[PDB]
Design an enzyme around this catalytic site. Structure first.
Site, mmCIF file in Angstrom:
data_model
loop_
_atom_site.group_PDB
_atom_site.id
_atom_site.type_symbol
_atom_site.label_atom_id
_atom_site.label_comp_id
_atom_site.label_asym_id
_atom_site.label_seq_id
_atom_site.Cartn_x
_atom_site.Cartn_y
_atom_site.Cartn_z
ATOM 1 N N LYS A 41 125.233 27.697 40.175
ATOM 2 C CA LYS A 41 126.241 27.222 39.042
ATOM 3 C C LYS A 41 127.494 27.808 38.864
ATOM 4 O O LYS A 41 128.314 27.272 38.157
ATOM 5 C CB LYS A 41 125.450 27.605 37.716
ATOM 6 C CG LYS A 41 125.293 28.985 37.220
ATOM 7 C CD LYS A 41 124.401 29.127 36.047
ATOM 8 C CE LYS A 41 124.846 30.398 35.182
ATOM 9 N NZ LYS A 41 124.384 30.668 33.886
ATOM 10 N N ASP A 42 127.878 28.681 39.710
ATOM 11 C CA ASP A 42 129.134 29.324 40.054
ATOM 12 C C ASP A 42 129.986 28.564 40.891
ATOM 13 O O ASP A 42 131.302 28.501 40.955
ATOM 14 C CB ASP A 42 129.311 30.752 40.451
ATOM 15 C CG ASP A 42 128.810 31.371 38.974
ATOM 16 O OD1 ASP A 42 129.261 31.339 37.976
ATOM 17 O OD2 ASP A 42 127.858 32.351 39.260
ATOM 18 N N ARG A 95 127.882 24.949 26.872
ATOM 19 C CA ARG A 95 126.641 24.023 27.131
ATOM 20 C C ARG A 95 125.519 24.750 26.171
ATOM 21 O O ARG A 95 125.144 24.067 25.496
ATOM 22 C CB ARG A 95 126.343 24.365 28.525
ATOM 23 C CG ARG A 95 124.800 23.766 28.794
ATOM 24 C CD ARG A 95 124.594 23.840 30.142
ATOM 25 N NE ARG A 95 124.526 25.392 30.462
ATOM 26 C CZ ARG A 95 123.347 26.235 30.178
ATOM 27 N NH1 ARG A 95 122.368 25.746 29.571
ATOM 28 N NH2 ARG A 95 123.562 27.623 30.445
ATOM 29 N N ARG A 96 125.425 26.088 26.310
ATOM 30 C CA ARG A 96 124.515 26.785 25.537
ATOM 31 C C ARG A 96 124.894 26.952 24.067
ATOM 32 O O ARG A 96 124.087 26.498 23.043
ATOM 33 C CB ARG A 96 124.373 28.290 25.772
ATOM 34 C CG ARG A 96 123.761 28.428 27.064
ATOM 35 C CD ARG A 96 123.716 29.975 27.536
ATOM 36 N NE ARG A 96 123.110 30.007 29.045
ATOM 37 C CZ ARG A 96 123.162 30.943 29.617
ATOM 38 N NH1 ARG A 96 123.974 32.182 29.491
ATOM 39 N NH2 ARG A 96 122.415 31.156 30.661
ATOM 40 N N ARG A 102 131.383 38.070 27.156
ATOM 41 C CA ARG A 102 131.638 38.271 28.772
ATOM 42 C C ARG A 102 131.301 39.518 29.432
ATOM 43 O O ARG A 102 131.124 40.456 28.756
ATOM 44 C CB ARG A 102 133.105 37.825 28.800
ATOM 45 C CG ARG A 102 133.940 36.786 28.238
ATOM 46 C CD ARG A 102 133.490 35.665 29.420
ATOM 47 N NE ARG A 102 133.873 34.333 28.895
ATOM 48 C CZ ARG A 102 134.925 33.856 28.849
ATOM 49 N NH1 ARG A 102 136.199 34.838 28.707
ATOM 50 N NH2 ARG A 102 135.345 32.841 28.397
ATOM 51 N N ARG A 160 126.702 42.952 29.125
ATOM 52 C CA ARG A 160 126.311 42.015 28.117
ATOM 53 C C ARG A 160 125.131 42.711 27.310
ATOM 54 O O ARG A 160 125.097 42.536 25.990
ATOM 55 C CB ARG A 160 125.815 40.554 28.638
ATOM 56 C CG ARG A 160 127.056 39.705 29.018
ATOM 57 C CD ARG A 160 126.545 38.355 29.573
ATOM 58 N NE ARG A 160 127.867 37.774 29.948
ATOM 59 C CZ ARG A 160 128.142 36.502 29.335
ATOM 60 N NH1 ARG A 160 127.191 35.820 28.718
ATOM 61 N NH2 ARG A 160 129.033 35.651 29.830
ATOM 62 N N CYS A 185 131.917 25.510 34.570
ATOM 63 C CA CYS A 185 131.297 26.320 33.727
ATOM 64 C C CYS A 185 131.938 26.523 32.317
ATOM 65 O O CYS A 185 131.286 26.515 31.238
ATOM 66 C CB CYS A 185 131.444 27.988 33.965
ATOM 67 S SG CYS A 185 130.695 28.307 35.579
HETATM 68 C C1 LIG Z 1 128.944 28.501 35.163
HETATM 69 C C2 LIG Z 1 128.586 29.700 34.570
HETATM 70 N N1 LIG Z 1 128.547 31.050 34.916
HETATM 71 C C3 LIG Z 1 128.181 31.967 33.977
HETATM 72 C C4 LIG Z 1 127.991 33.250 34.298
HETATM 73 C C5 LIG Z 1 126.507 33.448 35.280
HETATM 74 N N2 LIG Z 1 126.762 32.933 36.436
HETATM 75 C C6 LIG Z 1 125.492 33.321 36.906
HETATM 76 C C7 LIG Z 1 124.703 34.193 36.224
HETATM 77 C C8 LIG Z 1 123.221 34.646 36.385
HETATM 78 C C9 LIG Z 1 122.340 33.291 36.344
HETATM 79 C C10 LIG Z 1 122.202 32.728 37.608
HETATM 80 O O1 LIG Z 1 122.107 33.189 38.685
HETATM 81 O O2 LIG Z 1 122.132 31.477 37.427
HETATM 82 C C11 LIG Z 1 125.441 34.242 34.814
HETATM 83 C C12 LIG Z 1 124.982 34.855 33.662
HETATM 84 C C13 LIG Z 1 123.946 34.142 33.025
HETATM 85 O O3 LIG Z 1 124.020 32.931 32.767
HETATM 86 O O4 LIG Z 1 122.806 35.036 32.558
HETATM 87 C C14 LIG Z 1 128.118 31.042 32.523
HETATM 88 C C15 LIG Z 1 127.537 31.647 31.277
HETATM 89 C C16 LIG Z 1 128.480 32.163 30.361
HETATM 90 C C17 LIG Z 1 127.943 32.637 29.125
HETATM 91 O O5 LIG Z 1 126.629 32.277 28.896
HETATM 92 O O6 LIG Z 1 128.668 33.416 28.449
HETATM 93 C C18 LIG Z 1 128.146 29.779 33.090
HETATM 94 C C19 LIG Z 1 128.268 28.461 32.095
HETATM 95 C C20 LIG Z 1 126.906 28.128 31.686
HETATM 96 O O7 LIG Z 1 125.715 28.798 32.105
HETATM 97 O O8 LIG Z 1 126.731 26.942 31.125
#
Ligand SMILES: *Cc1[nH]c(Cc2[nH]cc(CCC(=O)O)c2CC(=O)O)c(CCC(=O)O)c1CC(=O)O
Length: 294
Positions: free
Chosen positions: A71-72, A119-120, A137, A143, A230
């Site tokens: 997702k990154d 999204r959440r 953040r 967190r 994201c």
């Molecule tokens: C695109 C996006 N990245 C994050 C931060 C993030 N990236 C990876 C993880 C761990 C889970 C995984 O491996 O898929 C995380 C942190 C997590 O979701 O636990 C986000 C979340 C930002 C937030 O919730 O503040 C996002 C956007 C999204 O998830 O929609």
């Protein structure tokens, strides 16, 4: 050469992913020397927040592969690089984390939920408009720290993240995809490398999990047409239901007033096109204006 360098972020979770990949490589290739090349990213301090520097490392021969949570990974790739391996998907669901509360519907009005994910945020506002969504953040641990420090009443995190860090006890309730549609590729780690690097590509083959690739290609085709990241309120999750990809997606306003949903089902071979079709259906149904909004 016989040496594979791995570029990765340096947070606890990022390093967990590096070792995960390193182990699967050593497993299939007993005499391969795997070197870790950890580094920081803009997001830790184009939309290359948690990826740009790893790409620069790949282009300068400072590394051979780059490991990311799917997702990154950006939808656009610079000339030469590309996503080549998608590992077995872990639990793709979001999770409600809290100390004093057992569920989302048990939080009193005014409770402060933490997440910077639009999204959440849009999905929770749609069902519980009486909740306060506060931005959050930092790494998983930071967190969790803020929640324990009472800065938030609850926070939403990916189930895959907490589980891998051995902090699965923090998962108060795994939210069903219907109630919180996952971000594209949540639960899967993807490996990026130089497309021309055949040597590296073949060594990486054994780590590709076909079924998970099918699911994520469809999810990403959807996102790529929507040209999101994201920072945009987009949901995109696919499953393999009886030999068919069932793709679901959404685009919603931060306040949760208007949420555009859509779905598509078809043969695995048409994953990319069904994702592209779904994206366009959402665009014509108002997603375009909502996205332009943010
Ligand atoms: C695109 C996006 N990245 C994050 C931060 C993030 N990236 C990876 C993880 C761990 C889970 C995984 O491996 O898929 C995380 C942190 C997590 O979701 O636990 C986000 C979340 C930002 C937030 O919730 O503040 C996002 C956007 C999204 O998830 O929609």
């Amino acid at each position: 050469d016989n040496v594979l360098r791995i570029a990765t972020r340096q947070s606890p979770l990022a390093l967990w992913q590096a070792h995960y990949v390193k182990d699967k490589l050593m497993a299939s290739h007993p005499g391969l020397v795997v070197e870790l090349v950890p580094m920081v990213t803009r997001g830790d301090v184009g939309q290359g927040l948690f990826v740009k520097e790893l790409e620069v490392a790949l282009l300068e021969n400072r590394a051979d592969i780059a490991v990311h949570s799917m997702k990154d990974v950006p939808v656009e790739f610079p000339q030469g690089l590309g996503l080549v391996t998608i590992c077995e998907r872990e639990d793709p669901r979001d999770a409600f984390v809290s100390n004093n509360y057992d569920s989302l519907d048990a939080l009193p009005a005014g409770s402060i939920v933490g997440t910077s994910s639009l999204r959440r945020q849009c999905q929770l506002a749609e069902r519980r408009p009486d909740l306060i969504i506060r931005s959050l953040r930092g790494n998983v641990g930071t967190r969790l720290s803020k929640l324990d420090n009472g800065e938030y009443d609850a926070i939403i995190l990916a189930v895959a993240g907490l589980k891998r860090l051995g902090l699965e006890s923090r998962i108060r309730a795994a939210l069903p995809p219907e109630i919180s549609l996952p971000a594209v590729g949540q639960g899967a780690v993807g490996i990026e490398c130089r497309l021309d690097d055949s040597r590296t590509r073949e060594l990486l083959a054994a780590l590709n999990h076909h079924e998970t690739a099918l699911r994520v290609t469809a999810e990403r085709a959807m996102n790529t047409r929507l040209e999101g990241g994201c920072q945009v309120p987009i949901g995109s999750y696919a499953e393999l239901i009886d030999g068919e990809i069932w793709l679901r997606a959404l685009v919603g306003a931060p306040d949760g007033s208007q949420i555009i949903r859509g779905e598509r089902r078809g043969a695995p071979q048409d994953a990319e096109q069904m994702g592209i079709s779904l994206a366009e259906e959402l665009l014509n149904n108002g997603a375009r204006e909502i996205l332009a909004e943010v």
